[PDB]
Amino acid sequence: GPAVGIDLGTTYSCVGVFQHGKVEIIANDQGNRTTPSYVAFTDTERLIGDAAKNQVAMNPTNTVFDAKRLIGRRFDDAVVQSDMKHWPFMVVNDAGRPKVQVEYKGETKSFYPEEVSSMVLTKMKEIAEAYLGKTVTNAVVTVPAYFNDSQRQATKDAGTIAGLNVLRIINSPTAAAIAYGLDKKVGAERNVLIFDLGGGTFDVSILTIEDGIFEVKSTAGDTHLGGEDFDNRMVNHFIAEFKRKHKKDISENKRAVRRLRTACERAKRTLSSSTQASIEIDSLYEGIDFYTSITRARFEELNADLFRGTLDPVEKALRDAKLDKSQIHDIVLVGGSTRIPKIQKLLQDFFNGKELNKSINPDEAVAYGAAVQAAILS
Numbered sequence: 001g002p003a004v005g006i007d008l009g010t011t012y013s014c015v016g017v018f019q020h021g022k023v024e025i026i027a028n029d030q031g032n033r034t035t036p037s038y039v040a041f042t043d044t045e046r047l048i049g050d051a052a053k054n055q056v057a058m059n060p061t062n063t064v065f066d067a068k069r070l071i072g073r074r075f076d077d078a079v080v081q082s083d084m085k086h087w088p089f090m091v092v093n094d095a096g097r098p099k100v101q102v103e104y105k106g107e108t109k110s111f112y113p114e115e116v117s118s119m120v121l122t123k124m125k126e127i128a129e130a131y132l133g134k135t136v137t138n139a140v141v142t143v144p145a146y147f148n149d150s151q152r153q154a155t156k157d158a159g160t161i162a163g164l165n166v167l168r169i170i171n172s173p174t175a176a177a178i179a180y181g182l183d184k185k186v187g188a189e190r191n192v193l194i195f196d197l198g199g200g201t202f203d204v205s206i207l208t209i210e211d212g213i214f215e216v217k218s219t220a221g222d223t224h225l226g227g228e229d230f231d232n233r234m235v236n237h238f239i240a241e242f243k244r245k246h247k248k249d250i251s252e253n254k255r256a257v258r259r260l261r262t263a264c265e266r267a268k269r270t271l272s273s274s275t276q277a278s279i280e281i282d283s284l285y286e287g288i289d290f291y292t293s294i295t296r297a298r299f300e301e302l303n304a305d306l307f308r309g310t311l312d313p314v315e316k317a318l319r320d321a322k323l324d325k326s327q328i329h330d331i332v333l334v335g336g337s338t339r340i341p342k343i344q345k346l347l348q349d350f351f352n353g354k355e356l357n358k359s360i361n362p363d364e365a366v367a368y369g370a371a372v373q374a375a376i377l378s
């Protein structure tokens with residue numbers, strides 16, 4: 001069985017396999033090339049991936065996500081403390097270790113963050129195995145560059161309990177670089193900038209590659225800035241619109257809002273290729289159908305400050321690395337949010353027209369690289 005590369009993401013995960021000199025990013029049951037890092041517990045079953053996310057509005061307290069933010073940390077971590085105040089699921093202390101508490105089959109159960117991730121990892125494994133038609137054991141899993149030893153350990157453990165023999169844990173920026181073959185020895189030092197704007201995290205990393213050896217010169221970003229924030233801006237915009245037209249503030253109905261958000265995330269994606277998308281939601285509030293639309297122009301303006309602010313961390317990364325804008329040789333786009341045209345324009349204008357590397361879907365870049373690395377390692 002060939003080794004696979006797995007991108008264990010904060011919001012979405014992806015798995016790819018190197019086969020016959022080519023890397024294939026594997027699609028799941030629903031045909032998606034990335035699957036949400038969601039796990040849901042109901043009266044009758046345990047849902048993972050699309051099935052889990054597809055019922056979040058209906059089962060909020062028992063639908064777990066953002067496990068990557070918990071993994072490898074302590075309950076006392078100020079991060080954990082700050083974060084938990086935003087999740088609809090319970091997090092409890094267990095001898096210093098945080099645990100997610102849910103109700104599975106009427107019985108109350110709690111899980112260590114590594115167990116939730118192992119569930120997502122299991123899903124990826126099934127996906128690869130269904131595709132390959134054979135058992136998958138060896139794997140290369142990615143982790144952010146800033147993950148400490150504990151977090152790396154936990155990620156490794158999540159792998160082992162999923163029945164995966166984790167060959168190596170590599171940083172995602174390095175994985176992105178390898179996908180573009182930027183590790184090929186050219187007899188010279190190379191500076192690369194990884195711009196990773198994902199579902200909920202923003203990471204900028206500057207790598208220096210010499211003789212086939214990576215060196216993370218600097219990193220910057222925002223652990224709480226991703227595609228979700230753009231979705232919210234759309235949500236708030238439409239709540240205001242619904243109220244003007246119907247005089248009904250749907251803010252309190254957690255379901256109506258969550259449904260609108262799902263509709264927005266979908267419209268958002270369409271806006272990356274089309275200039276406008278329609279929002280068709282039957283019975284949003286009471287029995288009122290919400291039928292409307294947004295233009296790319298309006299979308300961009302609703303997130304103007306967020307998009308623009310994206311550059312500040314880029315400047316920081318440069319100065320920490322002691323490099324000038326002209327000294328970086330390659331710029332690679334990672335993360336689903338980098339498919340947004342306004343983000344690409346903005347980064348390019350900043351780097352004075354420099355060509356951006358983005359022939360490989362940004363949300364599949366990390367998986368692609370890990371698959372290549374898995375291959376060389378096995």
Ligand SMILES: Nc1ncnc2c1ncn2[C@@H]1O[C@H](COP(=O)(O)OP(=O)(O)O)[C@@H](O)[C@H]1O
Pocket residue numbers: 009010011012013034197198199200201226227228265268269270272334335336337338339340362363
């Ligand atoms: N075409 C698109 N335009 C904008 N956002 C997109 C597009 N395709 C996927 N996304 C977004 O990218 C995020 C997923 O990013 P991804 O890199 O897959 O995740 P992660 O951050 O979990 O590694 C979500 O916010 C999703 O809405």
Ligand SMILES: [Mg+2]
Pocket residue numbers: 009010196198335366
């Ligand atoms: Mg990612």
